Predict the structure of WD repeat-containing protein 5.
Amino acid sequence: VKPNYALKFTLAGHTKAVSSVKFSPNGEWLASSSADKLIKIWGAYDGKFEKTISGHKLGISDVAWSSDSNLLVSASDDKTLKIWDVSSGKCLKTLKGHSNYVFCCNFNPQSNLIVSGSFDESVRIWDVKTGKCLKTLPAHSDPVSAVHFNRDGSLIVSSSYDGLCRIWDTASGQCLKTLIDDDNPPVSFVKFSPNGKYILAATLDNTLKLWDYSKGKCLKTYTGHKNEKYCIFANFSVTGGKWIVSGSEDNLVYIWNLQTKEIVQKLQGHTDVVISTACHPTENIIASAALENDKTIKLWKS
């Protein structure tokens, strides 16, 4: 079995490279962030522009939904993170304390915590209600490329250009695990599988890898794409077949069979690096966004 993703919509409006696209958990919306310092909301199914969210003083590298789809957090070069109420468009909290660029962000499943990663090599845990830094983790020896909470929020996974992936106890902030394979390429992305059993990690060696982090073992490897420079999001697609989805520096979206590691489809259309892809929570819909020479977001449906 292979999927049949076809292009349905091309969404323009960001005036600079897009950095990140993410579907709201309720399936209604698509949020995008960009080097243009703006967040944009779109209809997840029609790609219809909804609104622009602004306030960051510099470019944004990442945006993420709260579990109830009512809130957004963004990570920006201005060294801040911002909590947005999507309906009012209001900035509720501006989270400060990072010493350098914020690169990545995520709410935990209860959405009372935000985790952030920064060029200041730290991983930070923030309180959603008060907007205060609760814990600063001296996580890595290089910029932190991604941060993610597991299914219940007890664990955080981080990745860095230092070559490591690390698992953190959310409550204590202790490092519970350091994962690295036999080459030490920069880890450009990481995230838990939906069941929290695995961690999918991306490395700047054209390689995506699936780990059982409990066992510290790499189970699967997904190759064929080009990823040697940019921190490209990768995803688990579960709504139809079980796929791995990722952008590529060859201007292409890749789809792999999760079990057999075989490329099952490649999506053509973008004119620059597909920096970000996102998989819809209930439908077989992939969103993809590209870099400076493209600046568009595309919507694909199987």
Summary: The chain is about 0% helix and 50% strand.
